[PDB]
């Protein structure tokens, strides 16, 4: 009867039932094959771990992600992770409950067409629906207008939207996200000698990143604090026991969101592609978009990210009028929670994609369901 909502996270698959406040189970989107001998006779089974059991056993696995840049690449593994959601951790029959997949805007069509074809012809769900990420996040705001800095693990994107109506031409999207943060953090740990090489260490780099890295309010003046390096450094215990420490590399890594030339991609920062999105929008809406900026996605859980972009968009906006940065304390789950709302609306049960209308339509039916 009830619906399931399962945000296909680029880094962390978030899932749960409709109308629930918190998502039921959140596990990292990691499938992993083992890579060693296995001279034991009993424990050599289960030749592909996925999810949390791949997370704990990460030392003997080649951890690979099925989704990169918001684009689902390895469809063989992507079945394996969805089978882990429904059966292994939600323990629900997928043939009984309707689902609601979510995806980024401006991804390829085959990322959407295969995703519905692998949903019906494999899992036999009754009805599905595909939602744009950031337009779910306004339902989490409980507010019907304003652009969204939805920065995930794999992609960041801005979906400007006035009350009801979106701006499809002004949707901007950058591939710089948490993996591009993690890969750049791996580059700058080598300057302090902490050479973290392979995928098991690429996991523990993210544990360094999510526990330590903050973004600076003023980059140069706080870099000068790291010159007189007195109180900047913290220190992190690795899983083996030996401890690291990190100085200016702690805040220099999340400046990739603002200077994308650090990883060498030629783009504007997410403070500027914010303003470049609002300049693309029509002139009446611009007063309301400046008062309504929703930070969303797990990348935007950096401390100081709201105080930075409120300063930095103010540098780009005409200073005669106010800016606001709506950064709720549930930004990590905002796409799910707004997804949990939208499936629960009584005006929505005609907006699904049912199987009985799929069978004469084929996989192109989702292109005539909210583009």
């Amino acid at each position: 009867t009830t619906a399931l909502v399962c945000d296909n996270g680029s880094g962390l698959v978030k899932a749960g039932f409709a109308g629930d406040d918190a998502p039921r189970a959140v596990f990292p989107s990691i499938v992993g094959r083992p890579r060693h001998q296995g001279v034991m006779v009993g424990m050599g089974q289960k030749d592909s771990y996925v999810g949390d059991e791949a997370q704990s056993k990460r030392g003997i696995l080649t951890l690979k992600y099925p989704i990169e840049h918001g684009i689902i690449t390895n469809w063989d593994d992507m079945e394996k992770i969805w089978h882990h959601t429904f059966y292994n951790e939600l323990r629900v029959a997928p043939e009984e409950h309707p689902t609601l997949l979510t995806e980024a805007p401006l991804n390829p069509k085959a990322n959407r067409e295969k995703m519905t074809q692998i949903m019906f012809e494999t899992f036999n769900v009754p009805a599905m629906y595909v939602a744009i990420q950031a337009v779910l996040s306004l339902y989490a705001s409980g507010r019907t207008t304003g652009i969204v800095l939805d920065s995930g693990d794999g992609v960041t994107h801005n979906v400007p939207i006035y009350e009801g109506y979106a701006l499809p031409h002004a949707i901007m999207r950058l591939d710089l996200a948490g993996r591009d943060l993690t890969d750049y953090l791996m580059k700058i740990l080598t300057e302090r000698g902490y050479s973290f090489v392979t995928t098991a260490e690429r996991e523990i780099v993210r544990d360094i990143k999510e526990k330590l890295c903050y973004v600076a309010l003023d980059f140069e003046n706080e870099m000068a604090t790291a010159a007189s390096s007195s109180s900047l450094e913290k220190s992190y215990e690795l899983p083996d026991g030996q401890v690291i420490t990190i100085g200016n590399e702690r805040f220099r890594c999340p400046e990739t969101l603002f200077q994308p030339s650090f990883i060498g991609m030629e783009s504007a920062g997410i403070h500027e592609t914010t303003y470049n999105s609002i300049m693309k929008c029509d002139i009446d809406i611009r007063k309301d978009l400046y008062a309504n900026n929703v930070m969303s996605g797990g990348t935007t859980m950096y401390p100081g990210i709201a105080d930075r972009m409120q300063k930095e968009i103010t540098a780009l906006a005409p200073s005669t009028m106010k800016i606001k940065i709506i950064a709720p304390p549930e930004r990590k789950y905002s796409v799910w929670i707004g997804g949990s709302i939208l499936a629960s609306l009584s005006t929505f049960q005609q907006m699904w994609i049912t199987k009985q209308e799929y069978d004469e339509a084929g996989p192109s039916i989702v292109h005539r369901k909210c583009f």
Binding site: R35, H36, Q37, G44
Partner: protein, 162 residues
């Protein structure tokens, strides 16, 4: 018959396991070599649709994903004469993988699964899928003998050396 169809390059490099992995005694090399061939034959999205879902539709009854379907697949491989319509559709896929654009890189790795993992330990008694898929990649089919030899004993000189 499947013209206008193509694949993306290097589509299978993440799938091929390490050599220390395939030196395992609990390494059933069939369903992980097919899992390479499954990923390596993933059709690129630049192919048009009505040739895409037909070739994908041929696959799901030939190269399944679940470990119970491929185990069910081997069941008719014992009596492949009594199942003609699936047996006849297999050589179509053999024709496809013959014209695969990374055939040599497949055929290099295809018999790398044969020695290090022991995929071809039957050598003439392997079933119908592992027969012709290897024969799709190895043209002369000379994989029958050759991985078994390892040059055991030869001492052209002195004894133990310290």
């Amino acid at each position: 018959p499947f013209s206008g169809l193509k694949f993306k390059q290097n589509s299978f490099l993440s799938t091929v396991p390490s050599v220390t992995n395939m030196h395992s005694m609990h390494f059933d090399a069939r369903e992980t070599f097919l899992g390479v061939i499954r990923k390596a034959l993933e059709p690129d999205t630049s192919t048009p649709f009505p040739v895409r879902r037909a070739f994908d539709g041929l696959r799901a009854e030939i190269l399944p994903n679940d470990t119970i379907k491929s185990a069910a697949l081997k069941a008719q491989c014992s009596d492949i004469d009594k199942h003609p319509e699936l047996k006849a559709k297999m050589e179509t896929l053999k024709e496809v993988i013959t014209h695969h654009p990374q055939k040599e890189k497949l055929a290099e790795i295809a018999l790398q699964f044969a020695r290090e993992a022991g995929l071809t330990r039957l050598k003439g008694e392997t079933d119908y899928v592992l027969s012709n898929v290897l024969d799709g990649l190895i043209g002369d089919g000379s994989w029958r003998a050759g991985p078994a030899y390892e040059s055991y004993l030869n001492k052209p000189g002195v004894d133990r050396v310290i």
